C-alpha cells in the first residue's frame, strides 16, 4: 500500500464496522493489533464482536494481508486465537493485545 493508500486503508477499517454507542452495556472494548508487516499497530473496536471481525479489520486495513495466510494470538501464555467465530468475551480478548503471525 502507498503512503496515501494506508490512511485510506485505515479509514475503511475505522468506519466500515458497526459501533453502536448503546451496546457498551456489555463493555466497550479496545484491541491492539500486532502486525508482522514490520511492527505495525492499529487499535479500536466496539462492545461484543468476533475474532473473525478482527481478521476482517486486518484485511480492510490493508490489501496485501488478505491473500496471505496468518493466525492471531495473545503473547506470554502464547494462546493461538483458534475458533475464528469466538466472541471477544469468551476468549478473554478484552482490552488485550492481539499479535498476528504469518
Amino acid at each position: 500500500s502507498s503512503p496515501a493508500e494506508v490512511p485510506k486503508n485505515e479509514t475503511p477499517a475505522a468506519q466500515e464496522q458497526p459501533m453502536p454507542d448503546n451496546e457498551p452495556k456489555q463493555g466497550d472494548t479496545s484491541i491492539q493489533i500486532r502486525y508482522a508487516n514490520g511492527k505495525r499497530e492499529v487499535l479500536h473496536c466496539n462492545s461484543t464482536d468476533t475474532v473473525k471481525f478482527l481478521y476482517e479489520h486486518v484485511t480492510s486495513n490493508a490489501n496485501t494481508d488478505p491473500s496471505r495466510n496468518f493466525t492471531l494470538n495473545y503473547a506470554f501464555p502464547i494462546k493461538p486465537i483458534s475458533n475464528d467465530e469466538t466472541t471477544l468475551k469468551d476468549a478473554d480478548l478484552l482490552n488485550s493485545v492481539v499479535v498476528q503471525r504469518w
Binding site: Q32, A36, R40, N95, V97
Partner: protein, 179 residues
C-alpha cells in the same frame, strides 16, 4: 500525584520480559496484556517489558522479576516511572554475549540451547544494555545485549536475526552501573 509512577515489588510471574500491573491500574491508565511498556528507573537507565493483569499486585506499585529490577538498578521498595512505547518495532538484528563466569565450564552451541528457545515465538521486547537470564542444562547463563539495529530498543520476532559470539567477560561492568 500523577499515577504514572510506581514502586518495585516482588515478582509472581517468573518470566524475564514481563511486569505485572493490577486491573484497577489498567483503567487508571489504558494498557493491555500484550502491550510492551518502557520502564525508566534510576541511574538514567531503561528497560522494556510486557504488562499483564495481576490481581495480587494492588495499584500503587508493580511486580518485576529480579532481572528487570537489576537492569533498572533498582531494589524492592524503589520508585520507577512507567510509560508505554509502541513506536518500537520488530528487530532487524541483535547482539548478545554471555558473561564469562556464567559459562565457565561448558562450551558449544549457546544459540540452539539457550537463546533459540528463549526468544522463540515470544517476540521479547529487549533493550541495549540489558542483561537477561536463561535457565537450561543444569545452569543459568547471563547474556548482555550489546547491540540492536532498530535504535536502543527493539522486539525479537521470529524473523529477527539473533547474533551471538563466544568471547565472555568480567563482572566489573556491573559495578560501574551500581557505583
Amino acid at each position: 500525584k500523577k499515577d504514572n509512577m510506581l514502586l518495585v515489588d516482588d515478582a509472581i510471574n517468573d518470566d524475564n520480559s514481563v511486569i505485572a500491573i493490577n486491573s484497577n491500574t489498567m483503567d487508571k491508565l489504558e494498557l493491555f496484556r500484550g502491550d510492551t511498556v518502557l520502564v525508566k528507573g534510576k541511574k538514567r537507565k531503561d528497560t522494556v517489558l510486557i504488562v499483564l493483569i495481576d490481581d495480587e499486585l494492588e495499584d500503587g506499585a508493580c511486580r518485576i522479576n529480579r532481572v528487570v529490577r537489576n537492569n533498572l538498578r533498582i531494589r524492592l521498595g524503589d520508585l520507577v516511572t512507567i510509560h508505554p512505547c509502541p513506536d518500537i518495532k520488530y528487530a532487524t538484528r541483535i547482539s548478545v554475549l554471555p558473561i564469562a563466569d556464567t559459562i565457565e565450564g561448558i562450551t558449544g552451541n549457546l544459540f540452539d540451547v539457550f537463546l533459540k528457545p528463549y526468544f522463540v515465538e515470544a517476540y521479547r521486547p529487549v533493550r541495549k544494555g540489558d542483561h537477561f537470564v536463561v535457565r537450561g542444562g543444569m545452569r543459568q547463563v547471563e547474556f548482555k545485549v550489546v547491540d540492536v539495529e532498530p535504535e536502543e530498543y527493539a522486539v525479537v520476532a521470529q524473523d529477527t536475526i539473533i547474533h551471538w559470539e563466544g568471547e565472555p567477560i568480567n563482572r566489573e561492568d556491573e559495578e560501574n552501573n551500581m557505583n
